[PDB]
Structure formats: structure tokens, C-alpha cells
Amino acid sequence: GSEGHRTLASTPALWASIPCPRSELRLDLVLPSGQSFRWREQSPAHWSGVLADQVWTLTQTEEQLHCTVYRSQASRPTPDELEAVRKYFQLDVTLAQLYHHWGSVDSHFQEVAQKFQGVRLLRQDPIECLFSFICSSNNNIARITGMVERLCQAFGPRLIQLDDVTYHGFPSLQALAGPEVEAHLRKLGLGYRARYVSASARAILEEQGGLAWLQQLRESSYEEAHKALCILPGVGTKVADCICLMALDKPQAVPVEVHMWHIAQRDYSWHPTTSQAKGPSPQTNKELGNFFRSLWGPYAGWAQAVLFSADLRQ
DNA sequence: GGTAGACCTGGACGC
DNA sequence: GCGTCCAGTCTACC
Ligand SMILES: [Ca+2]
């Protein structure tokens, strides 16, 4: 009853809602789509994970986003806590308003979007984002998800336990920069990315001015930020774009990888026109990125998530 | 400046 | 059941 992960039905008094139609947000399309790797649908239609340093379970009805927190007297979320949820889902950004625009300038987007409404961008913490995506390179979303989990259990702060799941906060820079972390990460299966994590943790802390250097990018321009991020080991233009798009409030950032190339070719008959090569390459990927920005506008990154997330769904 | 290849790991095809 | 194939960054090099 008071044990295990909650359900809307099971413990009514402990939930609270946030006005939010499914047209504006589809948890099933956002939480497992490779933006964040830390949410799990423990019970059907119920997603649990760490948000704002606490564990939550989220679920929705047609017009409401129901939320619950596990902090010590169990009680429904407070308006201030719920605000953290709205901020995490950037709910002040109107999706219907963005879909309309993208749809009006791109017939193909219009066609596809009709079936995949409610795909928006989560506003993520820079550190988790940086290291989660450092783990994403040349890898599949399933292994990635396993790596990040193991990473947080071994190095992140212990939160609360539900059923047989012990939740952990994402590791701090100090923890990731620690001694023998690389060796430990290799035993956890991160492969060669084990060194990237260790090396980037130290680089940020011992050469770039620490957490402040990263946190200050949310005020810098996309061009600056993206360039700054690329210095870090394991962080290329692609990983840097994901971070810019998902953590540094750069909605125009467009991560170009295999999915996007196939979409460009199949749905837009796109070809590199100024680039040297015909296939993927540093030059062509950059060009592809510009094509989508020019096509979708300032929130091209978000538009990208709609088609991307819809691609995984096939 | 702009290519080729190697690359940890493990669920998937291919056969 | 085995070998090969896939899900970005980095580096040696022409
Ligand atoms: Ca690939």
C-alpha cells in the first residue's frame, strides 16, 4: 500500500495534477526517446525517475499531468515542487503553437506531426546531459540506458528505494573526476567512453573553471557554447549539439546523426550542395544542420525531436 | 583541410 | 548456434 512505486489508482490522496493536455505532452513519446535515459515505466503508463533531486512518478489523463513525489510524512507535491515539473517539461512553451508554424512551412512535417503530437524537449541539468551523451556516441539507446544507470548507482548520491529499485542522483563532477574512476567505469561496461567521462570531469574541474564554466553557457550564444563544449574529450559537434539543445537552452541546435541523414534523404530528397563529400562527414553534417535550421527556424532542434522521436517509432 | 579506420559492448540479423 | 552488423569521436595521414 504505502510500499512500492505509486499508481494514480492505488494512492489518490498522494497525487496532484498540472493542467496539461496530451496534445501538449506525451510522456510515452518524450521520456524514452533518447533525451533523458533515466526514466522507467515501472507500472503501465507510470514513469518514475529523479527530477530536481527527488524521485517522482508521472502519469497522465487526457487533460492532466498527474505527479507524485517521494521525499518524511508522505504527502502530495507542493505547488513549488510541481513548478519544478513544469520547468522540467518547459510547459510555458506552447507546442501547438510550434507545430502550427513548423507544419505551415513544411508539408512533410505537417503530415507526420498529426500522429505524433506532444513531443517536446526536456530542460535538463548540464552535468547529467554532458556525461549521459558522452556515453551516447557510437552506441544504441538500450546499452546507453544500462551504462548511465550503472554509472549513477556506483557514483551518484543514494536517494530512496521503491520496491527493489534504489534511486540515485546523477554523479557530481568531483565524483566523476575521482581516482581510478576510469577503471571502475570499464568494469561497468562503458568501453572506451570510460576514459572520456574521467577525462572530461577533470578537464572541466582542472582547466575550465569548474561547474561555473558549464553553467555559464546557458547565458552564452549557441556558437560559443557549442565551440566550448567540443574541447571536452568524447564531445564532438553531435554530442555538443544534444547538450546545447537539451541543457543549454539552445532550441535551434540540431543534432545530426544517422537518423537525421536517413530522414533528410528519404523525406526531403536532400543532398549536400556545398560540401565536398556526398555522404556523412564533418562538412556535410554541418550543412545538414543548417538546412534544418533554415527550414524550421529558431526551434529547429525541437522540430527535429518530433521527426526523430517519430522515427524510432518505426 | 578533408578523408579512412579503429573502436567497447551486446542485442540483432543473416544464413 | 557463430560471424557480421549497428547503434560518433578521435587520430593518423595524404
Ligand atoms: Ca554509425
XYZ file of C-alpha atoms (C1' of nucleotides) and ligand atoms in Angstrom:
344
model
C 0.000 0.000 0.000
C 2.367 2.675 1.256
C 5.153 0.466 -0.161
C 6.429 0.246 -3.740
C 6.004 2.638 -6.648
C 2.708 4.551 -6.508
C -0.129 4.450 -9.019
C -2.848 7.052 -9.525
C -5.444 4.458 -8.547
C -3.573 2.948 -5.605
C -2.876 6.170 -3.678
C -5.174 9.012 -4.909
C -4.518 11.336 -1.985
C -0.788 11.477 -2.801
C -1.111 12.801 -6.344
C -1.592 16.302 -7.696
C -2.193 17.440 -11.235
C -0.939 20.077 -13.622
C -3.237 21.367 -16.398
C -1.682 19.762 -19.460
C -3.427 18.140 -22.424
C -1.757 15.155 -24.110
C -1.595 17.298 -27.235
C 0.959 19.386 -25.367
C 2.860 16.432 -23.828
C 3.008 12.664 -24.396
C 5.147 11.083 -21.686
C 5.362 7.848 -23.676
C 6.901 9.781 -26.536
C 9.193 12.043 -24.531
C 10.649 10.023 -21.624
C 12.065 7.040 -23.549
C 13.060 8.885 -26.750
C 16.771 9.343 -26.053
C 16.561 12.785 -24.467
C 16.936 11.562 -20.897
C 17.997 7.997 -20.123
C 16.767 7.926 -16.538
C 13.001 7.369 -16.656
C 11.343 3.960 -16.365
C 7.720 2.997 -16.948
C 7.611 0.871 -13.781
C 3.834 0.446 -13.992
C 1.840 0.794 -17.195
C 1.648 4.470 -18.168
C 3.501 5.445 -14.979
C 7.014 6.852 -15.346
C 9.428 7.094 -12.436
C 12.797 8.832 -12.171
C 14.785 11.605 -10.489
C 13.677 15.187 -11.074
C 15.015 18.155 -9.134
C 16.934 15.821 -6.788
C 13.852 13.845 -5.701
C 12.134 10.741 -7.016
C 8.844 11.171 -8.888
C 6.274 9.039 -10.658
C 4.417 10.717 -13.527
C 1.286 9.627 -15.406
C -1.357 11.416 -17.436
C -5.015 11.589 -18.411
C -6.379 13.451 -21.443
C -6.251 16.885 -19.846
C -3.989 16.388 -16.821
C -0.401 15.567 -15.892
C -0.549 13.752 -12.538
C 2.542 13.850 -10.330
C 3.737 12.305 -7.054
C 6.964 12.728 -5.020
C 8.875 10.511 -2.627
C 10.994 12.636 -0.325
C 9.085 12.357 5.986
C 5.276 12.205 6.135
C 4.076 11.105 2.694
C 2.005 13.868 1.088
C 1.047 15.268 -2.317
C 3.548 17.520 -4.120
C 3.630 21.195 -3.134
C 2.906 23.951 -5.681
C 6.619 24.799 -5.568
C 7.624 21.181 -6.221
C 5.085 20.906 -9.047
C 6.706 24.016 -10.511
C 9.905 22.019 -10.833
C 7.965 19.598 -13.027
C 6.570 22.392 -15.257
C 10.070 23.817 -15.561
C 11.494 20.391 -16.433
C 8.948 19.971 -19.240
C 9.211 23.658 -20.265
C 5.419 23.759 -20.128
C 5.333 27.521 -20.674
C 6.401 26.747 -24.251
C 3.247 26.098 -26.277
C 3.678 23.050 -28.502
C 0.519 23.579 -30.594
C 1.965 26.990 -31.463
C 5.265 25.419 -32.619
C 3.652 22.506 -34.520
C 1.470 25.020 -36.372
C 4.490 27.006 -37.518
C 6.601 24.003 -38.496
C 3.584 22.485 -40.198
C 2.852 25.649 -42.162
C 6.389 25.871 -43.569
C 6.915 22.123 -44.090
C 4.173 19.936 -45.606
C 6.044 16.783 -44.660
C 6.289 17.860 -41.028
C 2.574 18.589 -41.096
C 1.805 15.095 -42.390
C 3.991 13.332 -39.791
C 3.167 15.544 -36.803
C -0.570 14.786 -36.905
C 0.162 11.314 -35.487
C 2.949 12.281 -33.058
C 1.681 15.200 -31.051
C 3.114 16.188 -27.696
C 6.825 15.656 -28.398
C 8.704 18.439 -26.589
C 12.198 18.989 -25.152
C 13.064 18.345 -21.530
C 15.121 21.101 -19.856
C 17.998 19.007 -18.481
C 20.785 19.549 -15.982
C 24.078 20.306 -17.790
C 26.169 17.709 -15.952
C 23.873 14.712 -16.443
C 23.350 15.738 -20.027
C 27.033 16.189 -20.774
C 28.004 12.807 -19.359
C 24.922 10.912 -20.477
C 25.542 11.946 -24.055
C 29.272 11.401 -23.738
C 28.051 7.833 -23.181
C 25.780 8.022 -26.264
C 28.373 8.168 -29.063
C 28.552 5.211 -31.478
C 26.040 3.356 -29.321
C 22.383 2.279 -29.083
C 19.790 3.721 -26.696
C 19.406 0.383 -24.911
C 23.051 -0.080 -23.884
C 23.357 3.629 -23.163
C 20.463 3.343 -20.746
C 22.231 0.474 -18.959
C 25.554 2.345 -18.758
C 24.084 5.554 -17.236
C 22.179 3.522 -14.634
C 25.291 1.620 -13.521
C 27.205 4.906 -13.569
C 24.738 6.602 -11.208
C 24.497 3.631 -8.807
C 28.268 3.423 -8.389
C 28.917 7.176 -8.204
C 25.710 9.075 -7.536
C 24.076 10.068 -4.218
C 21.674 7.428 -2.853
C 18.091 8.737 -2.727
C 15.157 6.493 -1.784
C 14.248 2.892 -2.526
C 10.955 1.738 -4.091
C 10.295 -1.970 -4.397
C 13.727 -3.333 -5.346
C 14.853 -0.143 -7.076
C 17.283 2.138 -5.237
C 17.312 5.556 -6.887
C 20.478 7.605 -7.267
C 21.089 11.247 -8.131
C 23.468 11.871 -11.033
C 27.173 11.875 -10.002
C 28.906 15.194 -9.256
C 31.972 16.392 -11.185
C 34.178 15.697 -8.186
C 32.957 12.116 -8.047
C 33.486 11.555 -11.759
C 36.947 13.150 -11.574
C 37.958 10.867 -8.698
C 40.902 8.413 -8.675
C 40.542 5.085 -10.524
C 37.131 6.068 -11.865
C 38.119 5.035 -15.386
C 38.997 1.512 -14.299
C 35.727 1.306 -12.386
C 33.731 2.561 -15.371
C 35.344 -0.082 -17.587
C 34.141 -2.812 -15.242
C 30.680 -1.289 -15.650
C 30.930 -1.657 -19.424
C 31.278 1.925 -20.680
C 34.025 0.758 -23.014
C 36.408 3.420 -24.331
C 33.945 6.066 -23.165
C 35.152 5.258 -19.651
C 38.182 7.483 -20.228
C 36.081 10.225 -21.800
C 33.971 10.527 -18.673
C 37.005 10.626 -16.367
C 38.972 12.952 -18.663
C 36.078 15.382 -19.169
C 35.339 15.508 -15.449
C 38.950 16.536 -14.765
C 39.105 18.932 -17.711
C 36.059 20.876 -16.503
C 37.292 20.981 -12.920
C 41.041 21.453 -13.515
C 41.208 23.591 -16.682
C 37.902 25.304 -17.409
C 36.971 26.800 -14.068
C 34.592 24.094 -12.877
C 30.817 23.839 -12.762
C 30.583 27.594 -13.294
C 32.168 27.354 -16.747
C 29.452 24.945 -17.836
C 26.571 26.664 -16.051
C 27.592 29.973 -17.650
C 26.938 28.634 -21.145
C 23.183 28.951 -20.608
C 23.900 32.689 -20.989
C 26.325 32.393 -23.929
C 25.429 32.115 -27.632
C 24.876 28.800 -29.387
C 28.036 29.368 -31.439
C 30.195 29.994 -28.363
C 28.666 27.208 -26.276
C 28.887 24.565 -28.985
C 32.532 25.517 -29.585
C 33.376 25.463 -25.874
C 31.818 22.026 -25.333
C 33.826 20.469 -28.152
C 37.098 20.865 -26.231
C 35.977 18.117 -23.836
C 37.142 14.549 -24.656
C 34.405 12.434 -26.226
C 32.390 15.523 -27.129
C 32.002 16.176 -30.849
C 29.689 18.532 -32.741
C 26.895 15.945 -32.402
C 27.235 15.407 -28.639
C 27.744 19.150 -28.240
C 24.521 19.834 -30.130
C 22.485 17.494 -27.921
C 23.832 19.287 -24.861
C 23.183 22.724 -26.368
C 19.675 21.664 -27.364
C 18.673 19.775 -24.239
C 20.528 21.521 -21.421
C 21.798 24.938 -22.517
C 18.544 26.424 -23.853
C 19.663 26.450 -27.493
C 16.445 25.379 -29.252
C 17.981 25.994 -32.700
C 20.648 23.334 -32.160
C 20.098 20.340 -34.471
C 21.934 17.089 -33.606
C 22.929 15.420 -36.863
C 23.458 11.670 -36.784
C 22.346 8.575 -38.757
C 18.628 9.054 -38.108
C 18.623 12.596 -39.424
C 20.558 11.688 -42.570
C 18.054 8.970 -43.488
C 15.177 11.399 -42.865
C 16.823 14.133 -44.941
C 17.300 11.728 -47.855
C 14.046 9.810 -47.672
C 11.680 12.643 -46.774
C 13.349 15.696 -48.310
C 15.484 14.208 -51.116
C 18.266 16.295 -49.557
C 21.827 16.266 -50.934
C 24.881 18.241 -49.776
C 25.360 21.133 -52.217
C 28.436 22.988 -50.971
C 30.108 20.155 -49.085
C 32.902 18.136 -50.690
C 31.577 14.639 -49.950
C 28.238 13.020 -50.791
C 27.903 11.027 -47.579
C 28.261 11.879 -43.856
C 31.319 13.939 -42.916
C 32.162 16.859 -40.703
C 31.336 19.308 -43.519
C 28.105 17.614 -44.705
C 26.731 17.123 -41.187
C 27.199 20.832 -40.541
C 25.454 21.621 -43.810
C 22.586 19.268 -42.964
C 22.254 21.050 -39.635
C 21.948 24.411 -41.372
C 19.364 23.049 -43.793
C 17.017 22.138 -40.955
C 17.580 25.437 -39.149
C 16.767 27.332 -42.310
C 13.732 25.100 -42.833
C 12.225 25.033 -39.334
C 13.505 28.220 -37.749
C 14.756 29.083 -34.198
C 13.262 25.935 -32.635
C 14.533 23.569 -35.312
C 16.013 21.384 -32.588
C 12.553 20.822 -31.136
C 11.133 20.102 -34.606
C 13.929 17.595 -35.018
C 12.794 15.767 -31.878
C 9.354 15.319 -33.388
C 10.605 13.591 -36.510
C 13.445 11.837 -34.646
C 11.219 10.500 -31.868
C 8.712 9.513 -34.557
C 11.477 7.694 -36.462
C 12.465 5.500 -33.500
C 8.771 4.590 -33.599
C 9.334 2.590 -36.796
C 41.874 20.943 -44.738
C 39.256 16.852 -45.726
C 39.062 11.662 -45.638
C 39.564 6.408 -43.878
C 39.638 3.184 -39.856
C 39.796 1.502 -35.378
C 36.790 1.382 -31.547
C 33.922 -1.180 -26.093
C 29.604 -3.758 -25.983
C 25.796 -6.580 -26.826
C 21.143 -7.222 -28.965
C 20.214 -8.134 -33.782
C 20.008 -10.061 -38.269
C 21.956 -13.256 -41.781
C 22.244 -17.962 -43.021
C 24.203 -21.878 -32.626
C 28.866 -18.355 -34.769
C 30.345 -14.390 -37.680
C 28.959 -9.853 -39.050
C 26.217 -5.607 -38.429
C 24.839 -1.266 -35.895
C 23.586 1.757 -32.563
C 30.133 9.393 -33.006
C 34.687 10.791 -31.784
C 39.310 10.559 -32.471
C 43.588 10.182 -34.950
C 46.973 9.020 -38.426
C 47.758 10.963 -42.923
C 47.724 12.351 -47.803
Ca 27.122 4.544 -37.231
